[PDB]
Amino acid sequence: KPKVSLNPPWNRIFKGENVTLTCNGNNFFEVSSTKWFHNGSLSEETNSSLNIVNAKFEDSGEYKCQHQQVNESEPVYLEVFSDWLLLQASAEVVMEGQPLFLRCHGWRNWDVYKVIYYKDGEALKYWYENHNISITNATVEDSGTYYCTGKVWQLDYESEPLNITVIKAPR
Amino acid sequence: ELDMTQTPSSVSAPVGGSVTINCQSSQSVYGNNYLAWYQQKAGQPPKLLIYRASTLASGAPSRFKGSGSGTQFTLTISDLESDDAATYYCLGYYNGVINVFGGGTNVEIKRTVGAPSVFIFPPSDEQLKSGTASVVCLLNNFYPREAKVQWKVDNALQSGNSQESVTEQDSKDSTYSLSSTLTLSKADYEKHKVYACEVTHQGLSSPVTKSFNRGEC
Amino acid sequence: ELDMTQTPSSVSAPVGGSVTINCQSSQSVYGNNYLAWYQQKAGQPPKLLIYRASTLASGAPSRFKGSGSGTQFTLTISDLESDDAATYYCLGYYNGVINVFGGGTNVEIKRTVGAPSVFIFPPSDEQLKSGTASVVCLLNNFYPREAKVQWKVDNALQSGNSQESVTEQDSKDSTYSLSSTLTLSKADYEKHKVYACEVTHQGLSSPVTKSFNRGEC
Amino acid sequence: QSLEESGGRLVTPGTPLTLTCTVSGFSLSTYNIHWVRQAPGKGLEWIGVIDTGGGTYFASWAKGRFAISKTSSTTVDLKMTSLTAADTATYFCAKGFDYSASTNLWGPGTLVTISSASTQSPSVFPLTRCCKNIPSNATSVTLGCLATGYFPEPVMVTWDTGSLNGTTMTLPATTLTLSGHYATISLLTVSGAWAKQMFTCRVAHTPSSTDWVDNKTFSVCSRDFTPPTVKILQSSCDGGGHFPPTIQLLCLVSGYTPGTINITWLEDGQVMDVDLSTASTTQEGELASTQSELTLSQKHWLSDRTYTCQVTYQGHTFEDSTKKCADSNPRGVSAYLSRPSPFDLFIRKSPTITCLVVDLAPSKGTVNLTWSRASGKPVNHSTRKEEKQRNGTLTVTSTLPVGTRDWIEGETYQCRVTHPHLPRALMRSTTKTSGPRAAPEVYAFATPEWPGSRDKRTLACLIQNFMPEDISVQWLHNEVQLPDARHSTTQPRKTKGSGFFVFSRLEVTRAEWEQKDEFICRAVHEAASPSQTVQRAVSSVNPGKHHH
Amino acid sequence: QSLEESGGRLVTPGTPLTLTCTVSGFSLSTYNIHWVRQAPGKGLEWIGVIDTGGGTYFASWAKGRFAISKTSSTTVDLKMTSLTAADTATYFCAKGFDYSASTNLWGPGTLVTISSASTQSPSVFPLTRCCKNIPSNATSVTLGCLATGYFPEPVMVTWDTGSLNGTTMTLPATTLTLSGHYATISLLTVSGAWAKQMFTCRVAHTPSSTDWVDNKTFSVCSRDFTPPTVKILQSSCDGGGHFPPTIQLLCLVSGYTPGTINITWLEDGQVMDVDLSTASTTQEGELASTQSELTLSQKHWLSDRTYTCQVTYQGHTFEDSTKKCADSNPRGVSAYLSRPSPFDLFIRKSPTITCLVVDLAPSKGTVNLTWSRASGKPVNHSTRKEEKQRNGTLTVTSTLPVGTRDWIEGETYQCRVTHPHLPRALMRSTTKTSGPRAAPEVYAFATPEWPGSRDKRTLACLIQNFMPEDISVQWLHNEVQLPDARHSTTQPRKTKGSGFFVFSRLEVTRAEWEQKDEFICRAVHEAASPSQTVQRAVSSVNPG
Numbered sequence A: 001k002p003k004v005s006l007n008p009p010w011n012r013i014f015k016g017e018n019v020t021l022t023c024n025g026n027n028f029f030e031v032s033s034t035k036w037f038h039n040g041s042l043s044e045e046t047n048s049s050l051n052i053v054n055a056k057f058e059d060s061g062e063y064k065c066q067h068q069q070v071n072e073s074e075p076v077y078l079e080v081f082s083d084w085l086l087l088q089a090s091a092e093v094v095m096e097g098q099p100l101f102l103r104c105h106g107w108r109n110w111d112v113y114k115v116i117y118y119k120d121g122e123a124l125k126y127w128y129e130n131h132n133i134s135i136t137n138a139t140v141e142d143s144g145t146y147y148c149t150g151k152v153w154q155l156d157y158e159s160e161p162l163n164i165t166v167i168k169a170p171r
Numbered sequence B, C: 001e002l003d004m005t006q007t008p009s010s011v012s013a014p015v016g017g018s019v020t021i022n023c024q025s026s027q028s029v030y031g032n033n034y035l036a037w038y039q040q041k042a043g044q045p046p047k048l049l050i051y052r053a054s055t056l057a058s059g060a061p062s063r064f065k066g067s068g069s070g071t072q073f074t075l076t077i078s079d080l081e082s083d084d085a086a087t088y089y090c091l092g093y094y095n096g097v098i099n100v101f102g103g104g105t106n107v108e109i110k111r112t113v114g115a116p117s118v119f120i121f122p123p124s125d126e127q128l129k130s131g132t133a134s135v136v137c138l139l140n141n142f143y144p145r146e147a148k149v150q151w152k153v154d155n156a157l158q159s160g161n162s163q164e165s166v167t168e169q170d171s172k173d174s175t176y177s178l179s180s181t182l183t184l185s186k187a188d189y190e191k192h193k194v195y196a197c198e199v200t201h202q203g204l205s206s207p208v209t210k211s212f213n214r215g216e217c
Numbered sequence D: 001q002s003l004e005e006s007g008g009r010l011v012t013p014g015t016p017l018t019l020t021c022t023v024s025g026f027s028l029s030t031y032n033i034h035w036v037r038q039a040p041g042k043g044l045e046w047i048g049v050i051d052t053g054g055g056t057y058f059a060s061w062a063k064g065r066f067a068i069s070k071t072s073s074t075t076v077d078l079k080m081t082s083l084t085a086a087d088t089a090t091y092f093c094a095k096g097f098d099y100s101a102s103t104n105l106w107g108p109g110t111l112v113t114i115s116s117a118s119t120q121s122p123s124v125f126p127l128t129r130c131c132k133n134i135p136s137n138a139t140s141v142t143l144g145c146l147a148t149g150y151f152p153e154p155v156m157v158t159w160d161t162g163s164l165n166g167t168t169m170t171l172p173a174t175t176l177t178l179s180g181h182y183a184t185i186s187l188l189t190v191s192g193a194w195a196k197q198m199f200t201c202r203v204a205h206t207p208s209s210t211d212w213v214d215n216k217t218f219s220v221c222s223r224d225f226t227p228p229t230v231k232i233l234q235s236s237c238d239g240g241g242h243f244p245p246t247i248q249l250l251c252l253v254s255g256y257t258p259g260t261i262n263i264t265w266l267e268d269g270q271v272m273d274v275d276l277s278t279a280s281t282t283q284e285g286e287l288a289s290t291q292s293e294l295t296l297s298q299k300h301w302l303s304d305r306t307y308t309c310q311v312t313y314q315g316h317t318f319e320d321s322t323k324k325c326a327d328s329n330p331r332g333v334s335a336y337l338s339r340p341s342p343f344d345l346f347i348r349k350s351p352t353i354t355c356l357v358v359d360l361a362p363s364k365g366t367v368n369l370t371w372s373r374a375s376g377k378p379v380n381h382s383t384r385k386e387e388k389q390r391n392g393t394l395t396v397t398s399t400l401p402v403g404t405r406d407w408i409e410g411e412t413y414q415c416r417v418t419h420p421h422l423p424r425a426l427m428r429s430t431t432k433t434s435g436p437r438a439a440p441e442v443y444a445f446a447t448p449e450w451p452g453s454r455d456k457r458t459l460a461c462l463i464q465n466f467m468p469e470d471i472s473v474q475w476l477h478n479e480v481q482l483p484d485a486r487h488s489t490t491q492p493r494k495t496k497g498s499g500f501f502v503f504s505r506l507e508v509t510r511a512e513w514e515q516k517d518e519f520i521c522r523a524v525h526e527a528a529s530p531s532q533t534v535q536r537a538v539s540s541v542n543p544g545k546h547h548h
Numbered sequence E: 001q002s003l004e005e006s007g008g009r010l011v012t013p014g015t016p017l018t019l020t021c022t023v024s025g026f027s028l029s030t031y032n033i034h035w036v037r038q039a040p041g042k043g044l045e046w047i048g049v050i051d052t053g054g055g056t057y058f059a060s061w062a063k064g065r066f067a068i069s070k071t072s073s074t075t076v077d078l079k080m081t082s083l084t085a086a087d088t089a090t091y092f093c094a095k096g097f098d099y100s101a102s103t104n105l106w107g108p109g110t111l112v113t114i115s116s117a118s119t120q121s122p123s124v125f126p127l128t129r130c131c132k133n134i135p136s137n138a139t140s141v142t143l144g145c146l147a148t149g150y151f152p153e154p155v156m157v158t159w160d161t162g163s164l165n166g167t168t169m170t171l172p173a174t175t176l177t178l179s180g181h182y183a184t185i186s187l188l189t190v191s192g193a194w195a196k197q198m199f200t201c202r203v204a205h206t207p208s209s210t211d212w213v214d215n216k217t218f219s220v221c222s223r224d225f226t227p228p229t230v231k232i233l234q235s236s237c238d239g240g241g242h243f244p245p246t247i248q249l250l251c252l253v254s255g256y257t258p259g260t261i262n263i264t265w266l267e268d269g270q271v272m273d274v275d276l277s278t279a280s281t282t283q284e285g286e287l288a289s290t291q292s293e294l295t296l297s298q299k300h301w302l303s304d305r306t307y308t309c310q311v312t313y314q315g316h317t318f319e320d321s322t323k324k325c326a327d328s329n330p331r332g333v334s335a336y337l338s339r340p341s342p343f344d345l346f347i348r349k350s351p352t353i354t355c356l357v358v359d360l361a362p363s364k365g366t367v368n369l370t371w372s373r374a375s376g377k378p379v380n381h382s383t384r385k386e387e388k389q390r391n392g393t394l395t396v397t398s399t400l401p402v403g404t405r406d407w408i409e410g411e412t413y414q415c416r417v418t419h420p421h422l423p424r425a426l427m428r429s430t431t432k433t434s435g436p437r438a439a440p441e442v443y444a445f446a447t448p449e450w451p452g453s454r455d456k457r458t459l460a461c462l463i464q465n466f467m468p469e470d471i472s473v474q475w476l477h478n479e480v481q482l483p484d485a486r487h488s489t490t491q492p493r494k495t496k497g498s499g500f501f502v503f504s505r506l507e508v509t510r511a512e513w514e515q516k517d518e519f520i521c522r523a524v525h526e527a528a529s530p531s532q533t534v535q536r537a538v539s540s541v542n543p544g
């Protein structure tokens, strides 16, 4: 089946931001055309990479792709927010040992200072400037509802929380 | 209940031409003749031209001629001059002691010569703290009232941000005074340098321009 | 291989006194009388007083008297003056053409005790641009020669950074003059304020101190 | 032989109104009196007539709302009842020869407003020409005042010219197209010794209040003197980048025409005591030079406070500003939303709320500022001020009138802030506090007399055990409630048990207590009874009756 | 009839050398020539003799190293080989009547030095006594020159004294212990009109070159030489903290005895062009004042270069320097430094200050916290403490006890923090106020009884018109100070005129006033006299 790839990987963007949904699988059948599914409706783009320029609120929702194969791809979800701080994250479900990058991102390349991450309420890490937490592994206790407090243009902003949960990759 | 229809509501005729203003009444006036014709300008009480529908009032010129009887009455104004820039009214008196005015009728016109004294006033520093800048152009002791004021902000002709005030005719030298206020924001005021008022008038052979630049005076 | 012993190496006698300088030879001189007596001051060649062990040289005064024979010879200076404060030598000529000088005898004129005049010199500003500061303490016109100079830099006694220069005994008043130079770096000079030279001499009942503070001048 | 009208003003709907036609020259036992009205932008409309015998007749639309009466031999009154907005008009009285209104003698008319836009006071600004465009011998000069932004009519401008003659000329008003308010230009032409003469315009606006007077004072030049320049220098921090233990600020007022000159230092706008700074004036030739030195602690400098050098020279103000330097200055927009004060709610009975938005970066475009109610019921029109500040930011203030009954019953009002450069919309909301109620206790005190404080005394007031926290404190003296700036009042803090407290401190002078030594501390508070105010008086005399 | 020696100079060990005795007046076919040497500080020593026939006879220690030759009718050469440092000597030639060296005609001698150091020219410095230590008359005065750092010997100093005479005295040379070079002092004592007379020493060093001549020309007094104070002032950034297009620096030389000056500006130690700055001078009474204005681009200022004001007054250099300032939060960290509380300072007499640093990262590598005084006097140990916060930051707090008297006399105390991740050290400084002093007024009031509140009262204390703002407030009941939680006191705010005020509020119970109804409001403030403490008691009684 053709799996669906995101460039950048982050399924949570800001309003006004770009992203390009690419969709590819094994080349058992040759790549000629692709079908796109915003919410279930067929999109008018045929070529394998769909660009998604300048996000609106209606750009939210379930996304899916298809090729000339028989069954379809998975329901990737795209939430779009307008706010001050979005704690972006790599994947919403991960399997142990895979890379995880976290990023408390601020509106239109703006710099967030005094950045503090919270995992389940407690302070996971604090850094003076913005920081990329990168955990190359993913324990089963890493599962938590995360959120980040930051300081953008001297004022304090808390991001909306996001729950993430790892499972065991055997079975 | 009873009506007076003054027709037309607007009429235009040049110098040497004439206008006719008709008043038609639903019921005949008292003694078939009791109607007046009034002349009114801006900010003034109306001035009596005709009383008793044909008889000229004292001080009115002979070029105002009233006529008519019963229900149908007509003011004819021949040999036009600029003191006829007015709204004209008719007044009927009736049985039952009833006075009703007419609807009104407007004419435009010009005549003699006397040149304007132009002055320009920059906005004050107390006004610039409030976020507004008003630039004042004064046209002083002039005649004709027909004069044109143009605003130039860095040689660009303004439109829609200026308002004029025209005075009454003076009781001594029979002249007019005008001011045009150009209203800008403080941010629009401080982005520009040259502020010019151009005055076109018939006693002026060329349009005179009074200007300043911002902050140098 | 042969010796000439001049005894004593130093002798002191006042003005009007007499000194005796003996030279003893290990082998007899040529013809039993070939010995000379010389007077030498600083910066000068020696001046012949006696030749042939008793004969007075030309220009030498009659108060210089040489005597002796063989191996044993003696110069006697009676009627001593302040000009006679010098170093005196004997010269023996021998068989085999050998000339041997004596060891020398310093004659000191015993004069009165003079207290030194102390002066202190701060380093110049043009020396401070080179990174070195030398502070100068001068001791002027003193007798006898023994004195002690101590440097105090913010009341701390210095050691190892000062050097002294002593003149010869003067030919007129028989006094001495001394200078002590304290050598510091510019950084060590500008870290301190009080610079004192303390002078101890036997004509002084107390050690006299001349000091300055940095600048203030 | 003329007629004049008087009594036209701004009143509410439903108010009775009496106009007066005063005649001169003729007799009312021979001539009749007509009344005619005219709204702005329509034609004339006959109202009525009174004859010599006193009989009045009115038009068909009048319906008994109008009455004419002969009050004296020269005055005729027109009484008018049941006013709505359709009667907003200019009213003429006329000498009638007969029952027809065909006449050549009319009064100039008086103006009656029944309106629904805001009663706005005029802003008065001087109109002087540029002085390089004014000639040396210019034996007369024309100057003026612009009175703009008022609603409704009229304004009355008179002139004080001093010892000169001045011909005064007031133009007809122009309706401003954006706001609907009015604007007048009144011009004064004088002659003679105008270059050193002080000129004064008096603008009265009777729809605001009967004694609303703006008394603007100015001269006719904007050169005046050669203009000084102000600059502030500061100490350097050292070679390691570290601040010295004290900071010197040197305010330099460069070459100006010699005169009295007057320097105030400000820390975030508040005047510091003159003892903490020096000042020096030198003169070289025909030109003066001024310097002022201010000494500050390193701590105060590092606390990022803003300091202003204020120069007052010949009645003209110059200024310069400084704050702690920075390589970069990030800042973001913030917003605050107040509740109405109890004084405005219950004494003035005209509550408002203010959304104050500060520290925005002055980018391109106006900031979207919208008021709304959670109930969906309509909001009133608000007022908006935008002001550039000394520290370089722009502060926008929006003031919304709120209903008194609306506020008391627990309505929630929202201030909504939008701007294209904003990430998201900013939201503030306000509503009456849902906590309990408790009445204030009030205690007023005077400090004793002691050396060095003979002609100035300090009064104090304690207000405590009240709930909720919103309260207004004023001081009243000799049938005037004294201005807020005269005294100081602390912020509400919690008492140990139940409720809040505030203290107020008022320094008074000898002339005030010799005028009246009774001073009243007044608290306005929602839980106070019976009329939401509580007050206590104190006399400072407090006489020493030892052992009673 | 005389003899003279030539050829003596400085050579290395092992270098052959030839001296020449030039004779005049007599014949070498009649007279013999003796050679005698003399090391410095040692007696005379015979070397050799040549006769009229050319036969040369030497001493026992010579061992063939010395050779004498007749070169002309007036010159006799002496050749030395195998020279070591023991041959450093003044060498004399003498007209010998016979093979005895008993003679009255000697040459002046030439100086032979055996060393391995570099030929260095002397540096000549004036030696003047300090003019406040010179008396007003001082009918003779002593001055001099120091000719130092030269190698080898000799220098010669003469003197130009003008219309004065002046006795000249030259001391013997001293070998410098560190370098091996020589140094001399030449002194001049003059009498007369020395205060206006211009004096010159002439130091010549013939081992450098034959016409190496240094005049040092100087007077007895340097031209007063009040050290002029240097200070640098600078342009403002504006009210938003933004830099202007250019930066002005103003170097001030304020209040000094007038004289010749310049001001030179350096950018990272290199001299900037003369047209880039303008200097001006004024005089007031006696004291002069000088200023110099330098214009810099914004870019240069922001490049963090060091700009130096170099003032040269009467030949001496005075300095000040600047670079772009450091804006107190390099990585978003904050640091705060308190003053002592007046209660701690004046009542307990154990004042402390506290340095608190917040929003540090919890990484490894301990922070270096150091305390100091601007005077360099010692400080005690402090209570260094770190703790991680619930929000993930790390705060370090330190409390230092300070001397009471030390604080009162205006010492400045500095807290210094270094972390490995910080790019530079962070400093905070605190000191006593520089404003005036005004003692507080204290007024204390008891509320009257309010209906329904029989068992409670409120006490109010007004403390006002004090300067500076630092103050402590305590309440006491039954001679013991009540806990701080019992009462509420506001923060200092300015009065209408001079000074500050606070209010204090204390709720009390019936049990307390029935136990003792007298309660004391006490203020501790630095301007209060005699023991920095003023109080006022209050009761809940009537006159009765």
Ligand SMILES: *[C@@H]1O[C@H](CO)[C@@H](O[C@@H]2O[C@H](CO)[C@@H](O[C@@H]3O[C@H](CO[C@H]4O[C@H](CO)[C@@H](O)[C@H](O)[C@@H]4O)[C@@H](O)[C@H](O[C@H]4O[C@H](CO)[C@@H](O)[C@H](O)[C@@H]4O)[C@@H]3O)[C@H](O)[C@H]2NC(C)=O)[C@H](O)[C@H]1NC(C)=O
Pocket (backbone or CB within 6 Å): A016, A017, A018, A053, A054, A055
């Ligand atoms: C998604 O990602 C891209 C980054 O790759 C973002 O921006 C793209 O930016 C380029 C450069 O601006 C766009 O290309 C073209 O831009 C022109 C204007 O900029 C150029 O020209 C001016 C002088 O005219 C120069 O000063 C400047 O430096 C640039 O060189 C437009 O004129 C082009 O034509 C069309 O564009 C506009 C768009 O509003 C239309 O309205 C016009 O009618 C015209 O037909 C051209 O667009 C490039 O297009 C941008 N990409 C996209 C997708 O727009 C995007 O902003 C980013 N999108 C997000 C985050 O939503």
Ligand SMILES: *[C@@H]1O[C@H](CO)[C@@H](O[C@@H]2O[C@H](CO)[C@@H](O[C@@H]3O[C@H](CO[C@H]4O[C@H](CO)[C@@H](O)[C@H](O)[C@@H]4O)[C@@H](O)[C@H](O[C@H]4O[C@H](CO)[C@@H](O)[C@H](O)[C@@H]4O)[C@@H]3O)[C@H](O)[C@H]2NC(C)=O)[C@H](O)[C@H]1NC(C)=O
Pocket (backbone or CB within 6 Å): A114, D303, E334, E336, E338, E358, E359, E389, E390, E391, E392, E393, E395
């Ligand atoms: C993670 O969590 C920690 C706490 O766990 C936060 O640290 C706090 O940071 C704030 C901000 O700096 C601290 O607030 C400061 O407290 C100082 C302490 O002063 C004491 O002494 C004075 C005088 O006696 C008293 O008035 C005061 O109440 C204290 O008892 C104050 O001096 C500071 O004042 C500063 O701001 C004011 C304006 O409010 C200025 O006028 C001053 O000049 C001065 O600049 C300030 O109030 C707070 O104390 C810290 N907490 C602790 C427990 O120490 C971290 O900030 C947080 N991390 C993030 C990213 O937020």
Ligand SMILES: *[C@@H]1O[C@H](CO)[C@@H](O[C@@H]2O[C@H](CO)[C@@H](O[C@H]3O[C@H](CO[C@H]4O[C@H](CO)[C@@H](O)[C@H](O)[C@@H]4O)[C@@H](O)[C@H](O[C@H]4O[C@H](CO)[C@@H](O)[C@H](O)[C@@H]4O)[C@@H]3O)[C@H](O)[C@H]2NC(C)=O)[C@H](O)[C@H]1NC(C)=O
Pocket (backbone or CB within 6 Å): A038, A039, A056, A057, A058, A059, A060, A061, A062, A079, A080, A082, D424, D425
């Ligand atoms: C594909 O499916 C998607 C989901 O099934 C559909 O997405 C949905 O679209 C609507 C409208 O586009 C989203 O509603 C958003 O817009 C309105 C109005 O915006 C105003 O309020 C915002 C509050 O966040 C402000 O930020 C704005 O500036 C503006 O003033 C709001 O009512 C919504 O806010 C609510 O929801 C968000 C989360 O989305 C919360 O954060 C808010 O607090 C509030 O509760 C939205 O902003 C709607 O949210 C969105 N659904 C999801 C799950 O995101 C999509 O339309 C569809 N596509 C097509 C083509 O049919």
Ligand SMILES: *[C@@H]1O[C@H](CO)[C@@H](O[C@@H]2O[C@H](CO)[C@@H](O[C@@H]3O[C@H](CO)[C@@H](O)[C@H](O)[C@@H]3O)[C@H](O)[C@H]2NC(C)=O)[C@H](O)[C@H]1NC(C)=O
Pocket (backbone or CB within 6 Å): A046, A047, A048
């Ligand atoms: C989907 O993505 C593919 C990526 O390869 C696009 O294919 C090719 O895209 C280019 C650019 O649009 C087309 O060619 C261009 O023609 C112009 C004519 O002026 C010329 O200037 C260019 O150099 C280039 O040759 C090309 O036709 C197209 N190929 C095919 C087979 O379509 C494709 O266009 C994308 N589809 C979209 C965006 O709908």
Ligand SMILES: *[C@@H]1O[C@H](CO)[C@@H](O[C@@H]2O[C@H](CO)[C@@H](O[C@@H]3O[C@H](CO)[C@@H](O)[C@H](O)[C@@H]3O)[C@H](O)[C@H]2NC(C)=O)[C@H](O)[C@H]1NC(C)=O
Pocket (backbone or CB within 6 Å): A001, A069, A070, A071
């Ligand atoms: C897309 O999804 C469908 C889901 O059903 C895939 O279907 C596959 O169908 C075959 C045919 O039945 C299944 O194989 C065998 O079926 C027989 C008879 O029913 C049964 O007895 C066997 O036990 C076996 O199940 C097959 O299991 C089923 N699933 C998968 C995962 O292959 C279809 O193949 C999918 N398409 C692609 C391209 O993956």
Ligand SMILES: *[C@@H]1O[C@H](CO)[C@@H](O[C@@H]2O[C@H](CO)[C@@H](O)[C@H](O)[C@H]2NC(C)=O)[C@H](O)[C@H]1NC(C)=O
Pocket (backbone or CB within 6 Å): A096, A097, A098, A099, A136, A137, A138
């Ligand atoms: C923890 O993470 C490491 C790093 O991802 C895992 O080790 C493998 O490391 C190599 C390094 O080149 C990667 O290429 C592999 O993809 C990694 N394997 C996996 C399964 O991620 C390691 O397995 C992880 N361990 C646990 C317990 O999660």
Ligand SMILES: *[C@@H]1O[C@H](CO)[C@@H](O)[C@H](O)[C@H]1NC(C)=O
Pocket (backbone or CB within 6 Å): D160, D202, D213, D214, D215
């Ligand atoms: C303005 O001037 C007139 C002139 O006497 C005076 O009556 C009026 O009170 C003045 N207005 C104010 C506000 O002082």
Ligand SMILES: *[C@@H]1O[C@H](CO)[C@@H](O)[C@H](O)[C@H]1NC(C)=O
Pocket (backbone or CB within 6 Å): D260, D261, D262, D263, D312, D313, D314, D315, D316
């Ligand atoms: C303050 O400024 C005004 C303006 O010239 C001046 O009249 C007044 O005397 C000044 N006061 C002082 C104390 O300088």
Ligand SMILES: *[C@@H]1O[C@H](CO)[C@@H](O)[C@H](O)[C@H]1NC(C)=O
Pocket (backbone or CB within 6 Å): E158, E159, E160, E200, E201, E202, E213, E214, E215
């Ligand atoms: C230096 O001074 C001496 C002393 O008068 C003089 O003879 C000599 O010529 C001077 N030399 C130079 C180079 O000025």
Ligand SMILES: *[C@@H]1O[C@H](CO)[C@@H](O)[C@H](O)[C@H]1NC(C)=O
Pocket (backbone or CB within 6 Å): E261, E262, E263, E264, E271, E274
């Ligand atoms: C003084 O300083 C300027 C600046 O470098 C320099 O050009 C000048 O030559 C100096 N003059 C003297 C006499 O040192």
